[PDB]
Design a protein around this ligand. Structure first.
Ligand SMILES: [Fe+2]
Ligand SMILES: [Fe+2]
Ligand SMILES: [K+]
Ligand SMILES: [K+]
Ligand SMILES: [Mg+2]
Lengths: 325, 324
């Protein structure tokens, strides 16, 4: 129950920057140790994003420990250090760079255009599991990685809730979280429903799971960054693409599981996501509609969307390679 | 406008040197020097105020109020960073529970009840008796607004620090109820706004308190709910929500006697539970942590400190109520 705590993960990293981060997380750490960690981390991320493959792997691993470890005693300082890395990352990302706000029509047109080109539904990994062609072993590979995406999604959504100062917008995210965490029954939380499916196909569902897939780490790192961003356009973009527009995959996966011999109860995880409302008829769309006139929101939202698609594609490509190797 | 509870406007209107240092540290481009300078000056100011300097006390509590409870999210992470520098000083001075070994679950539940027993406040007896004028009820409800209107945000900070999925689920159920279930017009802040309108008061979602004891109460409650040792936050959650049915039932009855309709007083009615606190699912948040002595000491320390700031606040409300 400390396997996903910061110190045990840092001690498994031979790099000197991991020792410096450990010092900044100590109980008696001062501003000197914390600032020293922040400077070394920023330099490491800079070197990796400029093309140093070793620095790149190291900074992504350290950002994963900083942003997603479960020892709350170190969380405030860990997120402080993560922001030093995020500032470097956002410098390197291609940016929307609009000078004036798109019209509401033009904004929605751009949104629709990008989703068509990049939807997770068109990826070989998705259609292959859609088609019913996956073996049980390949379904296990798919679902081991679905675990990492699902099991702490609600925590990222809670970070956006904390950043929504308007009481009615906070209410919208609380309704989302209530559904995600099982309404009146904790055993129906969507992490626990997925745990039930994993156990049905002979996998363990580890709530202290730590990924060793580089593309998965990058995906989870990005998702946490976006949902925590003080400019909520970043988090709303990932929330929109991953919750307001994905009831279609889960219907195709639910059907595929029932064909593979799974019961409706064991496949409940995908069933409970099947939905009927278009994205703009969802009450959460108002949070985006409200902000469309502000070009700063438009730039953050569109930049977030494109970066999400890039890391999602690399991740899904890597799962596919694992399924075919 | 509705951005006057942002941090920079408030700091600009505070004519003391520490306010300029803090404002410079909140800029997105602030350097480590600027942030560390503010943290040092705030910690020194808090220590002076805690040791009997009345001007420093008023100054640090006002700065902590701006840091911890302003609504501009652009500065929130650094604001909370600086707030912690003050919290570390405050907690040094607080009388602390000193259990050397953890109590049993049944012994711990009995011990926290003894803290509650240690209400009978003259204001509570006066209001519950039906003796208050509508002008006096206005005094009480003006301050109820400050306690209620952003309570959900403090509970959300506790949710963030509850790593177990089932414990997060319990707080999400609380937040769902607190924010109106399927209908945001029924969120508990908006239910209270309806009651305030009924009695003749405005309900301002950008309200800023000027009562020192109320500021101290809200500052403490945010600190406790945000603490990385969640014994602090679960202690105040136990008080502010799990064991308020009796108080809110008596207030509900008093407001009906004052001529409010059931609908107008819905805010209080929805808090009247049908079972005692141990029979609620939220109790498992506390029962699961009881074998941990650090949890127990933080929980008891937080209870006592919460009751100290609550009593000073209730005394000050009562003084205001008697003056009308
Ligand atoms: Fe879900
Ligand atoms: Fe409530
Ligand atoms: K910084
Ligand atoms: K925060
Ligand atoms: Mg009557």
């Amino acid at each position: 129950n400390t396997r996903n705590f910061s110190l045990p993960q840092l001690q498994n990293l031979p790099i000197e920057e991991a020792r410096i981060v450990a010092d900044a997380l100590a109980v008696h750490a001062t501003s000197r140790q914390i600032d020293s960690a922040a400077s070394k981390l920023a330099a490491l991320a800079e070197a990796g994003l400029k093309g140093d493959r070793q620095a790149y792997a190291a900074y992504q691993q350290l950002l994963y420990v900083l942003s997603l470890s479960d020892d709350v005693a170190t969380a405030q300082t860990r997120r402080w250090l993560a922001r030093a890395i995020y500032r470097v990352e956002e410098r390197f990302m291609p940016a929307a760079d609009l000078s004036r706000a798109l019209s509401e029509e033009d904004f929605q047109k751009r949104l629709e255009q990008e989703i068509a080109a990049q939807s997770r539904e068109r990826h070989p990994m998705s259609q292959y599991v859609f088609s019913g062609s996956a073996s049980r072993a390949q379904l296990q590979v798919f679902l081991r990685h679905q675990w990492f995406r699902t099991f702490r999604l609600y925590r990222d959504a809670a970070d956006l809730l904390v950043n929504l100062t308007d009481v009615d917008e906070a209410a919208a995210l609380a309704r989302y979280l209530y559904g995600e965490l099982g309404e009146e029954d904790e055993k129906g939380s969507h992490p626990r429903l997925l745990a039930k499916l994993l156990e049905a196909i002979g996998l363990e569902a580890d709530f202290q799971a730590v990924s060793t897939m580089p593309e998965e780490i990058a995906y989870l790192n990005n998702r946490a960054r976006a949902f925590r961003h003080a400019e909520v356009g970043w988090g709303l973009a990932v929330f929109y693409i991953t919750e307001l527009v994905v009831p279609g995959n889960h219907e195709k996966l639910y059907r595929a599981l029932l064909q593979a011999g799974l019961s409706e109860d064991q496949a409940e995880y995908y069933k409970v996501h099947i939905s009927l409302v278009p994205p703009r008829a969802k009450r959460e769309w108002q949070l985006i509609a409200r902000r469309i006139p502000d070009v700063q929101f438009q730039n953050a939202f569109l930049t977030s969307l494109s970066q999400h698609f890039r890391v999602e594609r690399a991740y899904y490509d890597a799962i596919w390679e694992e399924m075919q190797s």
